[PDB]
């Protein structure tokens, strides 16, 4: 879950 | 360390541009689109808050999922002191009291104006103090599930230690200004909870377009 | 003037189905809560209609702060004003373990870790009492001025009693959002009990849940 | 607000 938030934080 | 200059830089770097207001139908749909847009810039803002990125990734997820509602409310509330009334959205649209009440959010809109906007304008809260307050909101050690709550608490304590030093140095004639800043946070917590209740209702009805990121924040 | 010594006196002059016992202890405390506000400096000098508004606005947060601090001695539990202990398992088995855990983690244990004394507690309750945002106040700035004097006196007390803890004053103030959040949740539970009707609710607690 | 008024008047 939290697909978009994890992606944006990964950067 | 926790320098207020770095926190202030994080505010201005994500601040909406005059461009967008000059360039700018359903009120609630517009407000929700502004919220989705601002969640993306909220992630960039958090990355610019000192030490936030050094936290575990799961703690960054938890802090932003717990705080995004209050963080965004604090932003458009302080942003709206630049105008005489209403709320300036990050999309450039200007929500006035008539439109808010007709759209079904007049009471929560009024609470924003009376308890947040007007108090911020009265004490002339600057962006450095606002950024520190948001960083305090961000570093919420009570968030459920944090793998390292003590570090989050340490960071929050470093933020408001810097905030008190900044206030006593810049406003030495107002000894209670630091406490006055912190005592808007109960109202923010209450207004944040009430705002989510409206948002969940609009989501339940299903006649309000809710874009991807805001939709992801609303689904546990 | 807002001396912490008279705020501490208001605290001590007042210090004495699981859901059923909890509600009965709440009704007991609403009676002693009024006597506590009268002992807070300058509260009775406010207009009577303003005293009604402040007590109807803060009673829930005020009572939550009290039994939380009272429960610093108990572990995984909460000491009710009636003398009864509610353990964590009894609350969970009653369907209120979630709000019970929030009180334990965000208040009781946070109060115990920093060893919040009864003077600091009384000032926070006084700050909660003098809530300038309460709708309907005839003179909000009068109540705001009272709040400022309370936390001015509190910060002075903290620099005096704990001079080696420079951030203790703010640490105290930053328990108030969680208190506001837990207060709203406790209110939701109380209304739900009153709607379903399967829980006895005494007269004064019933009066605080009406318009 | 019967009860709260009476207890405040004393
Ligand atoms: C907190 C998230 N949220 C936001 C999301 C949904 C609502 C609905 C209740 C309309 C909202 O009601 C705001 C006032 C009318 C009470 C604010 C927003 C909206 C705009 C912006 C922004 O433009 O900066 C940021 N967050
Ligand atoms: C705020 C009024 N309230 C009180 C009233 C009702 C509830 C129900 C939600 C059960 C409550 O939930 C407490 C648990 C979440 C721990 C606390 C009480 C109860 C006891 C005492 C006391 O014993 O002093 C004071 N207020």
Name the overall outline of chain B. Answer: globular
Return the string of H and E elements of chain B: HHHHEEHHHHHHH
Query: Which ligands are bound?
Result: the ligand CCN(c1ccc(C(C)C)c(OCC(C)C)c1)c1ccc(C(=O)O)cn1
Main beta-sheet strand count, sense and barrel state of chain B: 2 strands, antiparallel
The side-by-side strand order for the widest beta sheet of chain B comes to 1-2
Helicity range of the residues of chain A? over 70%
Helix content of chain B: 55-70%
- The tally of helices of chain A reads 1
The amount of beta strand of chain A, in percent, is under 5%
Give me the oligomer status: heterotetramer
Query: What coarse outline of chain A follows from CA principal-axis ratios?
Result: elongated
Largest interface: B-C, 23 and 23 residues
What is the element string of chain A, with H for helices and E for strands?
A: H
Radius of gyration of chain B: 17 Å
Question: Can you summarize the main beta sheet of chain A?
Answer: none
Please work out how many helical segments of chain B DSSP would assign.
Answer: 11
What is the tally of beta strands of chain A? 0
Content-based structural category of chain A: mainly alpha
* Strand element count of chain B: 2
Query: End-to-end span of chain A in angstroms?
Result: 18 Å
Q: Work out the count of structural domains of chain B.
A: 1
PDB class: transcription
Keywords: nuclear receptor, RETINOID X RECEPTOR alpha, co-factors, partial agonist, transcription
Assembly: tetrameric
Entry title: Crystal structure of dimeric RXR-LBD complexed with full agonist NEt-3IB and TIF2 co-activator
